Amino acid sequence: IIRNEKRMLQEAVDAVIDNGRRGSPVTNPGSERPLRSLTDILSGKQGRFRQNLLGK
Amino acid sequence: YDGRTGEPFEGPIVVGQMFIMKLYHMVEDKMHARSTGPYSLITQQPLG
């Protein structure tokens, strides 16, 4: 049980950082769109560096 | 001729009936300008 939850810790935690760079991404319960994590806000064409700070 | 002057035009100009249409986009709607409005809750940027 220990290894089970102790590992679920690493997967959840790392999911809050980059969701989907390791294993299938986690989405809102029962629906579709994968939760946008920290690293998911930075990268991408709409990243805050672009859609907000390099143009607004 | 020229309704402004009354003198004709050096060359001839084709004319006559044609079918045209006023498209959806009308400045009456699209045209806009703001001064200080609401801002995106996250960052204080304005709204498209």
Closest CA to B44 of A41, A48, A46: A48
Contact B45 A48 (CB under 8 A): no
Closest CA to A42 of A54, A31, A30: A54
Phi, psi of A51 (to 5 degrees): -70, -20
Do B24 and B31 touch, CB atoms closer than 8 A? no
Structure tokens at B18: 């044609």
Structure tokens at B32: 């806009």
Experimental method: X-ray
Helix, strand or coil, per DSSP, at residue A38: helix
Residues of chain B contacting A54 with CB distance shorter than 8 Å: none
Phi, psi of B12 (to 5 degrees): -80, 155
Distance set, CA A12 to CA A7, A22, A45, B35, B44 (Å): 9, 11, 26, 44, 31
Resolution for this experimental structure (Å): 4.6
CA B31, B34, B40, B45 dihedral sign is: positive
Between residues 33 and 52 of chain A, which touch chain B (CB distance below 8 Å)? 48, 52
Do A23 and A11 touch, CB atoms closer than 8 A? yes
Structure tokens at B13: 């100009």
